[PDB]
Amino acid sequence: KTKHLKAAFLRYCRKDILGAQSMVDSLFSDSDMEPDDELDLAVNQISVDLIDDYPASDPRWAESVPEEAAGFSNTSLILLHQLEDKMKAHSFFVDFLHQVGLFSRLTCQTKGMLVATRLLLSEHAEKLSAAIVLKNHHAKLPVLVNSAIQLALDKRMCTVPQNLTAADVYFREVSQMEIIFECLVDKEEADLESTSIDSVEWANIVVNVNTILKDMLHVACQYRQSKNSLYKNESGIQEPEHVPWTASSGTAGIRSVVTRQHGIILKVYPQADSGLRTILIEQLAALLNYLLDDYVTQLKSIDKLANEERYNILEMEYAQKRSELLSPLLILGQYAWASNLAEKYCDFDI
């Protein structure tokens, strides 16, 4: 219940300072229920509800201990450093789970995504707190306009100054600010006047969004190379980090995040009318993006067990008819990138 989550959130408050008291409030949490199938999924919905309050505003564990949690002013201009403090707060939070233990409880189905274990939601809230700092690092008038439109579509904003328009709640849900900064590249595109060779500046703004959605997917990938498991990607751990493991983010293939990627590929309509070097940089870019999508489908297919195989072989045909749709798209493109695409979904021989 709410009382239990609000007692663990108060034992994390003391975990920054000392461990002995908080280790007895985990030992008293072996006065738990102990039936695996749903009550361990009831301390799961507690560890998950705190990993949603550590990416949110000032997390509800704060007050008693005024750590790096503290109610940072929302009238400050310190938005980026304030959110770096929250990736550190969510990092000492994963450590003060790993020691106290916190070695169980596990995602099901969320937004068309199937996920093996709740512990993928800690990794998923971490990857989407690296995404936030990346688009906080890139702040310019086109992106901040595309943001203000997105936020006003989801709901109204308070007009008591406080106008980023906001971000702490659009970090727990930053995935939405990618399906809409695409719909604002398309309504910008309707006024791009790129009917033929006349438009130029307007095919430069469609690429500036393509670069940011791309390096945001680069950041989710490298934060899945910085693992902690001594079995899952040994490189980056106590073993040499000179060779990274599979450059996939271990994303579960969202049916709105994937759709906005297969939308911006079909903005290969610009490479029809564009100067020669420009058509290559957006082609290397759309190659760089698709080599994250084919990587997350590969990581998800690897995790499938032998029974229920009928669903596993149907998900294979679905990815194979998309590597087969990413190929006719690059049959007109440069085949210097075909050698790379073929190695990226490392078969795709046809």
Partner: protein, 94 residues
Amino acid sequence: SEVDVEELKLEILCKAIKRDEWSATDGKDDPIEATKDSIFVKVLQNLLNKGIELKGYLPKAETLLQSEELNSLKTNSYFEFSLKANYECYMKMQ
């Protein structure tokens, strides 16, 4: 303590913001505090290499007591957005 040191310390740092002029350009904060900025760049003489306790040596200036004077001037609504914002990168400077 008789002639009020820390009252004047405020009077000046408050007219140091009135002359700055806190404004807004196209719905965005306008940091007029260019003089307040510069004065806090001028207090530090790099006394880290002079062997002085420069680290933690800006608690001369007040904070909650400042917005008391800002209310008297009627200017709290304009400048309190970047007063605190600059007071964050003045806790990193210090």
